Swiss-Prot record, chains A, B:
Induction: By D-galactose and D-fucose. The lineage of its organism: Bacteria, Pseudomonadati, Pseudomonadota, Gammaproteobacteria, Enterobacterales. This is UDP-glucose 4-epimerase. The gene is galE. Belongs to the NAD(P)-dependent epimerase/dehydratase family. Pfam families: Epimerase. Homodimer. Changing S124T: No major structural changes. Catalytic efficiency is about 30% of that of the wild-type enzyme, and affinity binding is similar to that of the native enzyme.
């Protein structure tokens, strides 16, 4: 199929693009490079074993979006593009709403204009809000996210829903991601955050590489087995694979298809730390700190539905997630080249 | 004060502009004329007894917004501009999200840019969602609106909230309107819907004027005193006055000030009909029809808070609302001139 991957050059997108090419689809990446570098492109093609076309641009530019859609005869769109720093989202709300809410709205408006009606959206478990009922299940009604980032994701899911309702021929998958980690097995592709990493894994990796002193464990008094926060980590390659499958099986299948993308199990902060210590061959330095604002104690996905409907489930383990990350971190301490 | 009134030429805006000028403020109207005509301008100035500056333009045009803000040294912004047809919103979701959500976002982004930090937003009781607890009170948590229109209003309230949180010097009033009706006492200004009116009052008026046959009463089996839907109708002049007061008392008073704007009492469809029959001197034709999709049985506002904090409450009655509407309808059967 002919797919446009917005945010194609970022973390999740790049991995997805490799898997898509491996499956022989024709890929067009659209990215504005605010959070990624052109250096990843050649890696994508190498690992993907096929050439992906790249277009530097912004989802907010409807006219360009429209043109791309048409120019490449796109069949489906996978939308990874947007801003995701939760804390920053609190400090800079307008930029989040603009890039996420208006950003998607301009893209789907361009789609309408070029008659493209297959969409895949990067959503998040955050949309469940403060749900005491775990694991989280697609049948649960949504809640209210605490940050501009999470609210922006729920607002988009709502706008897509309403759109499909008005244009019933559209197929729209709302993929609710859990906690993506890991990197391509080659160790030549991976997450390359700039500045202080906000997520656990990369932070741990940076401590291990010798860049950082100690990992600050945000809270040790939660109501969990070890008292640290519990989450559903999902290898980025499993996530990528899920995106190919969803795109191939749902194309032209009208409705809004919601699926949680997670391993279906929780791991605590310590469990992750221990996994990394083992991967890197040395104890990862850490200390206990106060709870992080807005953090929920524990949550993981109920991923039965994707198993059932798309015959998709993860296959990588936590150790693998840790090992693959250390391999990428260690092989490319400076990340992607300028 | 120097105020920019977006949507200034529409129903609520025009009335508000008159009251604002009467209070000697300097008004700048910004409207794109999608739902209003330039013919109202001279009426505004006449009734307002002062000249308002008019600028034809779209809230979606951030650069223009910015320029206006600066060019006129605006102190505060009253934002009435947007789309409001509930049913159409279901059929045309993207246009609603674009004009309402992106529309406001572009405006507040321009404000930020020109250093304007006083805002008044036209919100709605719809944001309360399906709340069994009536009357509705500003302390109630919001719910989930059933239409793209209502969702767009709640999404804006959320984005403004987050914005104030990030820029604590901002004063933002979220004015939740009930059911605006009526017209200026002169009978020379009023609501001028194009096509089939979606709201009760104007529809009734059109039946009375001889344009329409019968009023279709959407449902007679509700759990109300007479079985017809119950709402909080509020004269447009009371609403306008509330907007002046809120603007004068809250300017430079940091926070998010939420107030319900309603009479604080409910009236059924029949009560409104009977009021109009009396105003127009003839029985208004009507018939019972099936319930309208998405309609709630009964709801009204708890407006104690605005009483208490801004010393504001309505002063017009239901009869007045009906009489003023009939006077405008009858004096100008064709509405505003092309
Ligand atoms: N990584 C996570 O933990 C997490 C969890 C939930 C949801 N998501 C969502 O998944 C998607 C991918 O996240 P990721 O980890 O790969 O992030 P990422 O930052 O690596 O990828 C986002 C990409 O989008 C590009 N981009 C940003 N704004 C754009 C715009 N306006 N126009 C065009 N390109 C733009 C960035 O430059 C970057 O290449 C995002 O929407 C993110 O919100 C990720
Ligand atoms: N009338 C009601 O029953 C109702 C109830 C709740 C909320 N509101 C809100 O109150 C505000 C005023 O409503 P109203 O009854 O006066 O409606 P209206 O249609 O008379 O006024 C809206 C005005 O905005 C202008 N406009 C529309 N989109 C614009 C855009 N993108 N750029 C610039 N101008 C634009 C229209 O041309 C019109 O003059 C609206 O936001 C409406 O959603 C009204
Ligand atoms: O320096 C750190 C970073 C994280 N943690 C803890 O580790 C867990 C995971 O934190 P983090 O990696 O930030 O992930 P989440 O807060 O769960 O959020 C991720 O996953 C969400 C979906 O579950 C998405 O909405 C977000 O965008 C994404 O950042 C939580 O218990 C954190 O408290 C620490 O103790 N120290
Ligand atoms: O032809 C008609 C029109 C209305 N009604 C009834 O009269 C009442 C009022 O209907 P309407 O004037 O459409 O107002 P609402 O549905 O209550 O909505 C108005 O007030 C809301 C806030 O309460 C705003 O969100 C909306 O934008 C605005 O249109 C309801 O019980 C309707 O069922 C009829 O029976 N026949
Ligand atoms: Na429809
Ligand atoms: Na960064
Ligand atoms: Na680097
Ligand atoms: Na802040
Ligand atoms: Na109309
Ligand atoms: Na007319």
């Amino acid at each position: 199929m002919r797919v446009l991957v917005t945010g194609g050059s970022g973390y999740i997108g790049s991995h997805t693009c490799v898997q898509l090419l491996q499956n022989g689809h024709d890929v067009i990446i659209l990215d504005n490079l605010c959070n990624s570098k052109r250096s990843v492109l050649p890696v994508i093609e190498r690992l993907g074993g096929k050439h992906p076309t790249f277009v530097e641009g912004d989802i907010r530019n409807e006219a360009l979006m429209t043109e791309i859609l048409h120019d490449h005869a796109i069949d489906t769109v996978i939308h990874f593009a947007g801003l995701k720093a939760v804390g920053e989202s609190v400090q800079k709300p307008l930029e989040y709403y603009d890039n996420n809410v208006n950003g998607t709205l301009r893209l789907i408006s361009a789609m309408r204009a070029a008659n493209v009606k297959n969409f895949i959206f990067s959503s998040s478990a955050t949309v469940y809000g403060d749900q005491p009922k775990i694991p989280y299940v697609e049948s649960f009604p949504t809640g209210t996210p605490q940050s501009p980032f999470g609210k922006s994701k729920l607002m988009v899911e709502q706008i897509l829903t309403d759109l499909q309702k008005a244009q019933p021929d559209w197929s729209i998958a709302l993929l609710r991601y859990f906690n993506p980690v890991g990197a391509h097995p080659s160790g030549d592709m991976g997450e390359d955050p700039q500045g202080i990493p906000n997520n656990l894994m990369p932070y741990i990796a940076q401590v291990a590489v010798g860049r950082r002193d100690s990992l600050a464990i945000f809270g040790n008094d939660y109501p969990t087995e070890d008292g640290t926060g519990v989450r559903d980590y999902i290898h980025v390659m499993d996530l990528a694979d899920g995106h190919v499958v969803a795109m191939e099986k749902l194309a032209n299948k009208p409705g809004v298809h919601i699926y949680n993308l997670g391993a279906g199990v929780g791991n605590s902060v310590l469990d992750v730390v221990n996994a990394f210590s083992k991967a890197c061959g040395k104890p990862v330095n850490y200390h206990f700190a106060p709870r992080r604002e807005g953090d929920l104690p524990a949550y993981w996905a109920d991923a039965s539905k994707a198993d059932r409907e798309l015959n998709w489930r993860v296959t990588r383990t936590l150790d693998e997630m840790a090992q693959d990350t250390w391999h990428w971190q260690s092989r490319h301490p400076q990340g992607y080249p300028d």
